[PDB]
Amino acid sequence: LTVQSERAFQKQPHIFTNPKTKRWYKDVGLGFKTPKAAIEGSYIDKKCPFAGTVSIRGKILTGTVVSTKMHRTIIIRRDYLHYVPKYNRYEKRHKNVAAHVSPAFRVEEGDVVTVGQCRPISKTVRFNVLKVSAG
Amino acid sequence: GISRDSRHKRSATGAKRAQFRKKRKFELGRQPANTKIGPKRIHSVRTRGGNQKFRALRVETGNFSWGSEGVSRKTRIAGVVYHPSNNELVRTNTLTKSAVVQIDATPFRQWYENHYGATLKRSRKVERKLAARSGAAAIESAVDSQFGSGRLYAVISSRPGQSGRCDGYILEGEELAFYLRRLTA
Amino acid sequence: ARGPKKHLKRLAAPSHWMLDKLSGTYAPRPSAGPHKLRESLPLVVFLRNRLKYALNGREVKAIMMQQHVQVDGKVRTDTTYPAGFMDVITLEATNEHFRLVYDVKGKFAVHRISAEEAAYKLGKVKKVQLGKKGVPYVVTHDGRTIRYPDPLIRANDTVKIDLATGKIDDFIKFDTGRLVMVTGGRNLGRVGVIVHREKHEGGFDLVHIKDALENTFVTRLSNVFVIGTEAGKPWVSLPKGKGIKLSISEERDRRRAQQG
RNA sequence: GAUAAGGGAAGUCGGCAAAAUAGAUCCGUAACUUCGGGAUAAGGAUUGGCUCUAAGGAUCGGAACGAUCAACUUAGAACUGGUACGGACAAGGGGAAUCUGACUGUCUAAUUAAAACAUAGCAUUG
RNA sequence: UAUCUGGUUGAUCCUGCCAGUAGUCAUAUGCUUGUCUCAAAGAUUAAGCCAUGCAUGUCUAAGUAUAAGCAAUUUAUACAGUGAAACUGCGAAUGGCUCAUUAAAUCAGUUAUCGUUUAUUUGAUAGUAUACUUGGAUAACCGUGGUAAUUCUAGAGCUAAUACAUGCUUAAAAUCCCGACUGUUUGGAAGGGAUGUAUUUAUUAGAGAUGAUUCAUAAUAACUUUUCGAAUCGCAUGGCCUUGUGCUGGCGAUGGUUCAUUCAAAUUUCUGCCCUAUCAACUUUCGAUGGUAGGAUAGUGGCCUACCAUGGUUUCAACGGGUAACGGGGAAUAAGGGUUCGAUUCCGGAGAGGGAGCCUGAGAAACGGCUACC
RNA sequence: CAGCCGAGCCUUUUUUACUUUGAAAAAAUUAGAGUGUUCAAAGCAGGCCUUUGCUCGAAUAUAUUAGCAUGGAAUAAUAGAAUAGGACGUUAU
RNA sequence: CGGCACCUUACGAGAAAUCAAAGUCUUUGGGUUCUGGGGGGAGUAUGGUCGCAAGGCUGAAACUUAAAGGAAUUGACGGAAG
RNA sequence: CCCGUCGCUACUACCGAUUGAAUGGCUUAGUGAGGCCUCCGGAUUGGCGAGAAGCUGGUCAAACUUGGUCAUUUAGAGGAAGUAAAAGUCGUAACAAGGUUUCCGUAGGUGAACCUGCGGAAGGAUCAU
Ligand SMILES: CC[C@H]1CN2CCc3cc(OC)c(OC)cc3[C@@H]2C[C@@H]1C[C@H]1NCCc2cc(O)c(OC)cc21
Ligand SMILES: [Mg+2]
Ligand SMILES: [Mg+2]
Ligand SMILES: [Mg+2]
Ligand SMILES: [Mg+2]
Ligand SMILES: [Mg+2]
Ligand SMILES: [Mg+2]
Ligand SMILES: [Mg+2]
Ligand SMILES: [Mg+2]
Ligand SMILES: [Mg+2]
Ligand SMILES: [Mg+2]
Ligand SMILES: [Mg+2]
Ligand SMILES: [Mg+2]
Ligand SMILES: [Mg+2]
Ligand SMILES: [Mg+2]
Ligand SMILES: [Mg+2]
Ligand SMILES: [Mg+2]
Ligand SMILES: [Mg+2]
Ligand SMILES: [Mg+2]
Ligand SMILES: [Mg+2]
Ligand SMILES: [Mg+2]
Ligand SMILES: [Mg+2]
Ligand SMILES: [Mg+2]
Ligand SMILES: [Mg+2]
Ligand SMILES: [Mg+2]
Ligand SMILES: [Mg+2]
Ligand SMILES: [Mg+2]
Ligand SMILES: [Mg+2]
Ligand SMILES: [Mg+2]
Ligand SMILES: [Mg+2]
Ligand SMILES: [Mg+2]
Ligand SMILES: [Mg+2]
Ligand SMILES: [Mg+2]
Ligand SMILES: [Mg+2]
Ligand SMILES: [Mg+2]
Ligand SMILES: [Mg+2]
Ligand SMILES: [Mg+2]
Ligand SMILES: [Mg+2]
Ligand SMILES: [Mg+2]
Ligand SMILES: [Mg+2]
Ligand SMILES: [Mg+2]
Ligand SMILES: [Mg+2]
Ligand SMILES: [Mg+2]
Ligand SMILES: [Mg+2]
Ligand SMILES: [Mg+2]
Ligand SMILES: [Mg+2]
Ligand SMILES: [Mg+2]
Ligand SMILES: [Mg+2]
């Protein structure tokens, strides 16, 4: 696994290392801790909440990872009970949400992650992983 | 015409969506500039809000920056040598952003020699000023070697189809080593 | 659909204008201006429905085209000019000065003020930031831009505008114990002191306010307007009722005693 | 042995004879069916030349890398021309049904190749 | 009013339906109809077709008046009142109508824009390194017309601008770069360039704001078919003498760059739609899910392109089909729970015979705008 | 004097669901307060000795899944220290 | 203790026949699967699927109809008994 | 009381040669208007610039022909049903031990009800030796 695996040079925009590697990162706020793999790492991800240019704002969701077969993208499954008033009871329902995961996190199917909303970074991705709990 | 709406796509589940409404003007697209190298030819585009964009159809020169030295100069663009998106842009010499180009090295060589005095009649004070600037005058080997050919490697930073400029910065460091490896292969 | 709306149906008008259903199909659509459409009071509504100086929209235009109506010390000839909270309306021909302050019932009171008090106004600081050439400025709730403010002024503070020069006389920092009027929500018009500000990062901060009758209510910080440095010391004259909310039973008792 | 305006089987017992189709790549393919087929069903697109690009290996050296060597296949692009290009050669016409024999096979050398004979399967007899 | 009654038997008790009964902001129809108030009304079938007329125009002291228009001589021989025609500006993107399409679409509640555009309103904001004021067009107008026919217009002759195209006028310093000469232990310097604001890069503050940013803002080096820092209009006419058409100046129109604000827009988070399995797999050629780079867009985004992975949805009902389906606020009936309806006075969406493409503009994929096909 | 709620001390002292409260939630419609439209359906008017003006008003509830904030910890789930890779040393080395 | 049943009673249930479950059901809520909604047309037609076939499984509608049906009572009748 | 062929009348739906027919949506392929962008072009018209027709290549893409598919209606010789009407012909299958107890599944036979074989059931005509 190497950082420079694309046809273009991978780097953080406008972060200049004068030859005569400097890394930029930020905290996302809302009491979420920046993983040290972002402060000290070497991966380049324009969509990472901590090392990229995306911002976390909107809704914070939690869910169970059900797919890690995409590159830097996971799908989480959110389970909830839908109330049916006529029968005064509930029915189990689920929604699948696609979220971006930065290389600062390691997630497998079955983990519980916390994702924060960001700007649309794909056709179906609007959430970006902020926290991981092993399962 | 060209439309950027997402209605014509099928959903994430794969279902084809029915036609909701006629194409709206606030979701239009236009055609690529496909900037070439030749005597300057720029057409204005009237955009939303009455604003203006510039299609660079042809440009010769651009503003290129030597980041380490903190100097920017206007210099000719020789040709496109590498493009991470499509190799046909290299073959046809189409200037877009992130295109690797060769720029004329003379304005930077002239600044370097006038600023430091080395190569790649003065007063006593001028010679002392140059001596003060000495020691910082040693540049990277991979950059120095290019001056023999009189052409530096650069990457386009502006968007020529959006601003009409074909500007960039001079390749340096491991980015220069990266694209050198790409070019030699 | 293809552009901005220019009409306002009568039923869709803000309820605090207190327009009648059957007088027509349309309502005065407030112009663009210092105050938002939903939180404003057009001068046609003020001069015809509130003061009853004009009998119709033709008459309110006749009144305003004679240069009588001033908003914040400036002549306005736009009959649908969006006058709003803390704005001063002057009709020097009748020698009357009004300030648009909410009453406890949720509406804009017809609140007459003295000429000395009509010479200034209060503005809630929405943002403080740097303009071009590194010049700081303050944006108040009525869209005013005051340059070179006191460097101690921050958002949610209240500034006192000279209203003739547009300058800042002095200010009130937002803090516990300050006198406050609520400018939004179901507690609109109530007056009390800040008891405790509860912060919610990424959400809405909530302010706990205690009435002069020791009634406590919670309202959004965006609905909180500082109007005084402490209890019983407002920087503007309060409308009749002092922003004290009475229950419907208390109001009925008060009306019974007032009317016999 | 060729060609033929317009029509296109009106010719004739009968489309006999001739014409039309035809290679390859890609797409698409119905009834019915003994599930094996039908099927190249039907029905469409492309194809030259030139200049390039990419992929697909072997042997050595302690190596995700270097050195040397090597076969024709496939895919993509630009350009180009009287829109031509399986350029000669070579090379299926197709479909809806009825009668009949299941099929492959066989015979009247020298007028009949068929529905005739055979056949597997079935049954009977000694 | 939380209600029942008639009908199977020779008679009985049941199951069970049929029938009766009441309402409908529920339609039609029959018969009948004196008064007052209030008031729906070509939705259903045909988003079928339309004769005719009207439905969007607009001028203030303050853009342009030599009407060969009217009116009076008046503070006026540049014009001066009123005022057709035209140019210019703005509006015509609102309103009104309808419900055909549309089943995670619309819509509702709830979010976001640290992901954008924004005429207008309201606040702020520009001394930047020929001038007593620049040009040449054109309309209306006059008179020659062509066509059967249109809100068609053509030659020729005039003439204006807040139309069009250009262009100066200015503080005081200070700072930076090159630098002849010079001092000669590294200082001084003549002389050249550059400074506002916009654009586009690259590199530095940002250790004032935010929950959070590569934010606001500033700086350095440049760049640009070089943005704009008023060649405008009305009323008053004042002050200083150095009495020269001397120098100064009062209230306003209109306009202008950027920021803010307001009116908006475009995308956008979460959850929620009726029947159908005689619909169980769907999507992915030729974008389906994701990654990298770009193009395009006002901006995010497979929105589009190139390359690369093989992903994405589904019995918690995907996909397909039906709807005599625009969604909601709501409506009818109602002990409670429910059932049924919502084309239709408000909000959102969509359409203007069916499609599609555009021009202008801040704003339209506009149809009482255009272009083409049917 | 009992009863009913709230407290505060002393007794060794991770994820939900649910329920409470709140904020924010268009008007019209619904329920509902006031008010002699001559009554009423409605409307949001109106009333005062008669006014070179005085003056009550234009309430209040309901929405309900989802989201936001919040109090409670019964009921129903969920996780933890078993090859200890377990917990504390606040100033342990 | 587990079974296969049986006898009595009816607290209780039921329209009744009867039922120790067919009880603990308007004083209506232990858990869960399947099925029915007046009689016919009709388990028919059509589509699918399984089967070599016979056929199985899934499965309508038009139309038609005021009853069809359950349990019991009295009588009448019986090529039933006494 | 009652069942089924058969005969008359009327209605509803079904099968059926006709490669039946009609209407609407989507779509392959072919052809392809027009605008927009781009490329040259350069009528004439200002002092090098502006610039019309037209041209090159793209892009969005209406529309037509063929084929495919989906959907909704509809004709049909003949065949085979159901119901209603009347109780017409033939018999007597069921209801009593209905005169051979009845019924279920299955398989043959037969003008028709039905009969027969095999295995079940009691809803039996036996709760019993
Ligand atoms: C000199 C040879 C030719 C001359 N040309 C003149 C033009 C012409 C045109 C035709 O029609 C346009 C045509 O029709 C057939 C035939 C001809 C003759 C045929 C002849 C060869 C031919 N002779 C008879 C048979 C035969 C057999 C073969 O084996 C064989 O191989 C060498 C050839 C032959
Ligand atoms: Mg469930
Ligand atoms: Mg409209
Ligand atoms: Mg916020
Ligand atoms: Mg011929
Ligand atoms: Mg011919
Ligand atoms: Mg023919
Ligand atoms: Mg013939
Ligand atoms: Mg013939
Ligand atoms: Mg003949
Ligand atoms: Mg013949
Ligand atoms: Mg032949
Ligand atoms: Mg073929
Ligand atoms: Mg044979
Ligand atoms: Mg022979
Ligand atoms: Mg012989
Ligand atoms: Mg022969
Ligand atoms: Mg009966
Ligand atoms: Mg209609
Ligand atoms: Mg109507
Ligand atoms: Mg309809
Ligand atoms: Mg019509
Ligand atoms: Mg209709
Ligand atoms: Mg329709
Ligand atoms: Mg306007
Ligand atoms: Mg991108
Ligand atoms: Mg991408
Ligand atoms: Mg579905
Ligand atoms: Mg419809
Ligand atoms: Mg209703
Ligand atoms: Mg509705
Ligand atoms: Mg409806
Ligand atoms: Mg509706
Ligand atoms: Mg309505
Ligand atoms: Mg509407
Ligand atoms: Mg429209
Ligand atoms: Mg119309
Ligand atoms: Mg049309
Ligand atoms: Mg219109
Ligand atoms: Mg249109
Ligand atoms: Mg019209
Ligand atoms: Mg018993
Ligand atoms: Mg028993
Ligand atoms: Mg039934
Ligand atoms: Mg269909
Ligand atoms: Mg018998
Ligand atoms: Mg018998
Ligand atoms: Mg017998």
Ligand SMILES: [Mg+2]
């Ligand atoms: Mg018999």
Ligand SMILES: [Mg+2]
């Ligand atoms: Mg026999």
Ligand SMILES: [Mg+2]
């Ligand atoms: Mg026998």
